Subunit: 146 residues, 7 copies
């Protein structure tokens, strides 16, 4: 037999995010709506940033405001909230100092301390249940070196 | 770098199931077979039901009779048994009263007492060892409000 | 709501391993490294073997020599040592007699006495600290009936 | 049968924490709230630090301020307090001298005397009961050598 | 090193149970069976109830009738008997008056006198030895304020 | 509140060991080392055997030769010596007659006279102090009816 | 409605590879690049070989040397390393004996023990970061019977 396995990779020499255990971030996450409290469960994962130069600050921002949208009704939207390193991310660029990230906390140089990434969504109107259906959205997290 | 994390969610304003610790139910379970006793281990998890209205009864049923089937032989089947709240579930719809579920037992309104969910399988013929191989199946648990 | 829980199972009519309390073996284990003594902590669990026929001997072997490898450097390796029933396992097949396992020690037929399984790792060079990073590996324990 | 047990380990040649009995620290802890005194129970464990070089000081800090957050409401928070070696830990780095830790108190070189680790939480407003629900959080304890 | 310790807590502002020495109740108990008398040993622990309001009665009940079940045979069952405060608990709700509990017997307000909790099991048929194997079950004790 | 207490039990209809006061045997024991005499303290407990049939002999043996091993060095071992009923136990099976055990010495039928169980360890080389550290081991006592 | 689902299959009566859980191998894999260590993450999957005749040896080779190439610059290349069964694969043909594969380890005849497949890539010049961009490549694994 012949088995053609396609191998693909994306390379950025400067920066990237990886999980605290040394694995790539998940490509998809699942949220749960609970009717009693009218809110969605948050997704939390501990991430470490790998950098080529540890002396420069890190700028984190979102490419666009993420929104959960119904697969059958593009009109219905629900905002998505993303926070990294304990601060809420948005289109405006946040800045993290190199000393705050704690590079080389372990024996590996260029790897910072674990930073928590939180993904969550809320109804667009407070105290109102969202319309039934399946929702989907994309969070475009952009990280660049100072 | 840019990391496109896809966020998806399914919303039902009326009812749903969550674990007793406030987490979504597992998407996959594993059963073990012991050759000496010719039986499979059961999977048990404690679940709590969240409802928009606590005064209505709850109807629980299975969409279809689940069966473990060999991944390499669709002919070989093994029945799966599912029980929730201490009663055996089937295609015929069971009914649970609102008072039996014990809503608002804790300080959170609309959340009932913990109900145990049991997943298990048995050989289709009693006292006969199943054929060797890998088996798989899907349990489609359907819960609706009265 | 509909919740599609996938149920999967692997069946071998002859033999398998289970924990002494009647649970499946863990799918993952964690080792701890202490800088002071340059050695890793061992993982120990008490297991019982279930057999269809108690009169036959048991052959235990490893599919391949396990090694801890760095997730970021496939070149760096650390050997893993596995021992079951008080004897060191390897690629060469060990043999355990049916009388040594003590079948039906309790009231259940076909279940032997508790056998200890030990998982441990050591640096590839004695007296040298391993390179910092996260390591991973797989132990493929193979058990077959005589 | 074949049983694929995944073995993973994290190695830091310089420093780490272990329990006083020579076991890894627990990955999860449980706190208890008492309605009568409006306070949470503290978690206490005796830990020993293992070092490659016993002549250097030890710096202990938290990667971020831990907070207990409701699994269903990311808005509700409760601060977590962590203290090690009798001093309260925070984002600002504490320093412990090598003589204060008492290295080689027993016959093992590079192992210090037992240091107590305390994990506790309190309501964000004094004298006010927290909202009912399930809370979760992560404490990221960072220890590095001087 | 970085050590991510997960901290979790469950909060009910009204009521809860704690041990007489101020510790959380055990999450697991062990029963012993003696062949000579055909009965199981009882588990006894002294508990104190903490309440936000000491003037209201206390309702105690079980979410479902607990049963010991064989880990390898879901058909085999053994009933579990639970009694708190000297009275047998069941699905029907018991009621304890605020004066009978003796609140503030010591210097701490809102804490009652010690109440004994008894967990025990018996064979489903009197005078018959249970089938050999390992048994497990869950007791869901529900306590609410009047 | 809801408190999920897990109840588990192991049943053997034929035989078992219990303490002379009617309690289960301890799951863990502690040994002390005195530098002055290069020996370990022995652990002694008085046990009574409960049997379904008092006319049959009792066979007592160890599943494997117990050894104290260093938690940080699996190479270092220390033998453990176990004796029950005044005779040294080993892998080879001992036999105790029904008349020697003195069944029904008290008013309870099927319960024998008190038999002493001794657990002790010694250095693997006589007159040599063991290496410093923490040691652990498991004694697998197997008792079966004739 | 009419839904035209195209069904296609490739048949080789002699040999093929499947995952250890009985699924086809993935058609695409993703590699992660970390700037700090200047290396790519490896892809590891456990595979089992199915054969028509278990007495013949197995020859494994690559059709051509795989290389990661930039989608926008065909000049930029990065070598891909593939290893199966613990040995590095190349254009020269490796040979695996029928006894080393351990056929019929489980109850299914003609299925061998689990063999690990590793896919990884490295920069063409050691210690040099690859040029930024998206890379792609194909691994043509050829397996034939002796």
């Amino acid at each position: 037999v012949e088995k053609n396995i396609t191998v693909t990779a994306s390379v950025d020499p400067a920066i990237d995010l990886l999980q605290a255990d040394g694995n790539a971030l998940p490509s998809a996450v699942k949220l749960a709506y609970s009717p009693a409290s009218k809110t969605f469960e948050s997704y939390r994962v501990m991430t470490q940033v790998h950098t080529n130069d540890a002396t420069k600050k890190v700028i984190v921002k979102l490419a666009d405001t993420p929104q959960l949208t119904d697969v059958l009704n593009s009109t219905v939207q629900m905002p998505i909230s993303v926070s990294w390193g304990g601060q809420v991310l948005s289109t405006t660029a946040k800045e993290f100092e190199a000393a705050a990230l704690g590079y080389s906390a372990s024996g590996v140089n260029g790897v910072s301390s674990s930073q928590e990434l939180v993904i969550s969504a809320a109804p667009k109107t407070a105290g109102t249940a969202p319309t039934a259906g399946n929702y989907s959205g994309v969070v475009s997290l952009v990280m660049t070196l100072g």
